[PDB]
């Protein structure tokens, strides 16, 4: 209700407007262009990219290509299906992204049909390594990261899926100086601390941190573990049992989803307001000019 500024018609005329995906602040196009431009000598070979966006209590992970008509998704992996594998809680922790990382990396291979090779690492000791090319065989799948708007800080949850993608049978170019525990004073790396973070060490150490110091803070959070009778000593066992469970059958069994589309569609138009017709526009302004400007 600030009419003092009174942005003129001239200002509203020559105002250049940003792109729709930028006007709403969802895409940084300075970084975007350098990530999608394929080598022109490669002709019609797509450059696949992997997105990781951390929304509230959920993680976005999918393999997506690009096209003039629009970006094309190859495979998808969501946090909501981790309870099916056995990860019922902790959907937005650092280790949760890694669990999806093994899930997303493995899932693309089945539909590709090349999962027989490039198994990644199955022991997971937290050590740095890439999925090296197999001699006398297909080259390893390469895919880049997509972060966009959350700042690159070491220990970020985005790099949890990076380890999962890297150790899940995919090749992603990445370095060690941003993982959760890489020393800043020197080039030292401690995979042992990473091995805890990969397997939920951070949450597990905070389990006993409240189990002896203060119970009311422990009680008000962690409601599910108390209700489901899960302790810290079994917390890591969940993730260890999770990893091989993902590789058992990562077929992305779709939900029964209940009902059908039309009743979902029917529930919308029955309550959503429609447009207005020109006769309705003329009718009310005639009524308004009669009721208000007609002087009773």
């Amino acid at each position: 209700a600030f009419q003092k500024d009174a942005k003129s018609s001239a200002y509203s005329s020559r105002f250049q407007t940003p792109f729709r995906r930028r006007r709403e602040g969802k895409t940084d196009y300075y970084q975007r262009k350098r990530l999608v431009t394929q080598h022109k000598a490669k002709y019609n070979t797509p450059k696949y990219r992997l997105v990781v966006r951390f929304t509230n209590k959920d993680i976005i992970c999918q393999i997506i290509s690009s096209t003039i008509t629009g970006d094309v998704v190859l495979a998808a992996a969501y946090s909501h299906e981790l309870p099916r594998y056995g990860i019922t809680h902790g959907l937005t922790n650092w280790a949760a992204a890694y669990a999806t990382g093994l899930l997303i990396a493995r899932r693309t291979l089945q539909k590709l049909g090349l999962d027989e090779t490039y198994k990644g690492v199955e022991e997971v000791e937290g050590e740095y390594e890439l999925t090296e090319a197999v001699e006398d065989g297909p080259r390893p799948f390469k895919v880049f990261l997509d972060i966009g708007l959350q700042r690159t800080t070491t220990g970020a949850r985005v790099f949890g899926a990076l380890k999962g993608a890297s150790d899940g049978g995919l090749y992603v170019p990445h370095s060690e100086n941003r993982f959760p525990g890489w020393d800043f004073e020197t080039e030292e790396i401690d995979p042992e601390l990473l091995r805890s973070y990969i397997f939920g060490g951070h949450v597990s150490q905070y389990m006993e941190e409240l189990a002896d110091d203060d119970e009311e803070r422990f009680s008000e959070l962690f409601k599910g573990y108390l209700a489901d009778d899960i302790d810290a000593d079994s917390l890591e066992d969940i993730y260890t049992s999770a990893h091989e469970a993902i590789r058992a059958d990562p077929a992305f069994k779709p939900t029964e989803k209940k009902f059908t589309k039309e009743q979902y569609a029917a529930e919308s138009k029955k309550y959503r307001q429609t447009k207005l017709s020109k006769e309705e526009r003329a009718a009310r302004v005639a009524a308004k000019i009669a009721a208000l400007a007609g002087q009773q």
Partner: protein, 220 residues
């Protein structure tokens, strides 16, 4: 100097205005453009005979200054100062350049020929198009006879064959004379200082009620 206007009568150059590249330009000779009863309202002066030029030429500020004095001095003494609203509708923008050769015995010292002949500004003259309206009188119907002759006495001081035409349509605002009378009582007229603000059908309804009361009620 003030060489005869026969040199600058004709449009012989591109427009050369007073811009940041145009410094040290002499001031315009004409000082006041609108004169008479400038505060007069719109409906008080139904008639205004214009004065239109016929050909392409440039009219200098001195010519505009001399004509305005001649026109104003006439109607003020016979019709009275509170009888007309005279306006000048041309502004001197083109700048006149001279080469400035001295008049004494030169050659050996005068200008070393016409080398670098670009000159310095001498005056400021307007640019007049074909059929472009010059002047406007805004008089009353009973005063047409005096005013028309007054513009006749002023057309002599311009260079050219400019003519006077019996104008129409309340020649202070646009839109035809019989149409203006139709909108005088219909309620599309707001009595504003000098000019009159018309009615719009595309703005918001709420604000229009305030300044335009006698359109939506019974009125007359």
């Amino acid at each position: 100097a003030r060489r005869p206007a026969r040199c600058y009568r004709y449009q012989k150059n591109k427009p050369y205005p007073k811009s940041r590249y145009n410094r040290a330009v002499p001031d315009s000779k004409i000082r006041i453009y609108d004169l008479g009863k400038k505060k007069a309202t719109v409906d008080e002066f139904p008639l205004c005979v214009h004065l239109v030029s016929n050909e392409l030429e440039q009219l200098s500020s001195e010519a505009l200054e001399a004509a305005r004095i001649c026109a104003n001095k006439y109607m003020t003494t016979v019709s009275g100062r509170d009888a007309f609203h005279l306006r000048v509708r041309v502004h001197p923008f083109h700048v006149l350049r001279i080469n400035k050769m001295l008049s004494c015995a030169g050659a050996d010292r005068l200008q070393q020929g016409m080398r670098g002949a670009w000159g310095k500004p001498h005056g400021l003259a307007a640019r007049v198009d074909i059929g472009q309206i010059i002047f406007s009188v805004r008089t009353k119907d009973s005063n047409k006879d005096v005013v028309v002759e007054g513009l006749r006495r002023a057309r002599y001081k311009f260079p050219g064959q400019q003519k006077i035409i019996l104008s129409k349509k309340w020649g202070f605002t646009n839109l035809d004379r019989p149409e203006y009378l139709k909108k005088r009582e219909a309620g599309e007229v707001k009595d504003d200082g000098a000019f009159v603000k018309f009615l719009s059908k595309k703005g918001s309804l709420e604000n229009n009620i305030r300044e335009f009361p006698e359109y939506f009620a019974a009125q007359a």
